[PDB]
Design a binder for this molecule. Sequence first.
Ligand SMILES: OC[C@H]1O[C@@H](S[C@@H]2O[C@H](CO)[C@H](O)[C@H](O)[C@@H]2O)[C@@H](O)[C@@H](O)[C@H]1O
Ligand SMILES: [Cl-]
Length: 138
Amino acid sequence: PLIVPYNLPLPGGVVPRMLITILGTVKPNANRIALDFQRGNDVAFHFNPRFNENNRRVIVCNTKLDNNWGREERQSVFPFESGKPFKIQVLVEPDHFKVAVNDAHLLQYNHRVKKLNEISKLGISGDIDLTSASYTMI
Ligand SMILES: OC[C@H]1O[C@@H](S[C@@H]2O[C@H](CO)[C@H](O)[C@H](O)[C@@H]2O)[C@@H](O)[C@@H](O)[C@H]1O
Ligand SMILES: [Cl-]
């Protein structure tokens, strides 16, 4: 029962073969969830399930540099369900973050921020009960 928003330090940043696992349950009538992999004030990878954008469910991914959001990448596969437990796994690979939800591949997001070893925090926020957040080298 972690408190959201939750900050998970990523010591020495991320690197290929690092697997980040987030376990929680979506609140009833959820509106949003966000993962923010941060390089200081920059957001290297924002992963943002939206449960009601014009009565559609969509995941928005983006990067924030010098306080400016870039060009969004959108995924209409939407594996989250209000009220239900989920597992998000983010595997860092050489060219992208690779995301699986509930053991099914979801999307990849190419690295825009190049200094992976400076992406040293993960913020987890939004309409969830957060059970755990951790990493391991695989
Ligand atoms: O791009 C991800 C980013 O989206 C914004 S909402 C976004 O704001 C821009 C201007 O900054 C446009 O107005 C666009 O139509 C849309 O409203 C926000 O949700 C942020 O947390 C992040 O998800
Ligand atoms: Cl960079």
